[PDB]
Amino acid sequence: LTTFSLYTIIVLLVITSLYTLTNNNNKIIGSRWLISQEAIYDTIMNMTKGQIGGKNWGLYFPMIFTLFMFIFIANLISMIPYSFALSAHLVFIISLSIVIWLGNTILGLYKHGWVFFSLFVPAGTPLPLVPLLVIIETLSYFARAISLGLRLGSNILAGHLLMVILAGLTFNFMLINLFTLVFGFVPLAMILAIMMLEFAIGIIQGYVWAILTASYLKDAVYLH
């Protein structure tokens, strides 16, 4: 039982005790908890129409939802100064990006086969421009997949360390100054600001990850 695995168990303990453990009013309302997830559920459902809609948007809806839930929960409890968040390695976020891309192509290669190679040439770019575009398009396909995984994990690592580095400075300030007042609450004020940012960025980057993985699904199912 590594730190990753025990954290993953804590994730599911929280997951069930928001909507699965209310289940009593037999209505659409009756608990503000229910309003919370269906708000998120509706934001992604209409987003599923707006990005994947047209033949099978609802077919692939859960993966975007489950991944968004996975990133959302993993980013909620990540601020406490002793948060050894996701083992301080975050290597799986890269792995999630790799498997998401790798599954994306097999779906593309299964549903299109050789036609999947025609995606590198959207509208024009004739034979003189074909090798340049297919190089840019194919390298890009590797490019944003690896970038997606690294950006989320590094910023979580960056946010966690800027918790500690600033915290050590506050310890230095509150120990040296005898009678003055403006030495520690201002560094505490930045700590309050920099923690709100880390909490905020995790919410949108989960959304950004949700939008991005949605965006790549369009390219696999729909050729343009």
Partner: protein, 37 residues
């Protein structure tokens, strides 16, 4: 409430699952190759 109305669970979600399996085979050998223990 939890009344199970059947929905696609595995019928259309196979490609990412087989992609995951293809990852797994090799995913453990990468650690074995780069053991460094």
């Amino acid at each position: 409430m939890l009344k199970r109305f059947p929905t696609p669970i595995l019928k259309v979600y196979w490609p990412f699952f087989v992609a995951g399996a293809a990852v797994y085979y090799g995913m453990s050998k990468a650690a074995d190759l780069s053991s460094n223990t």
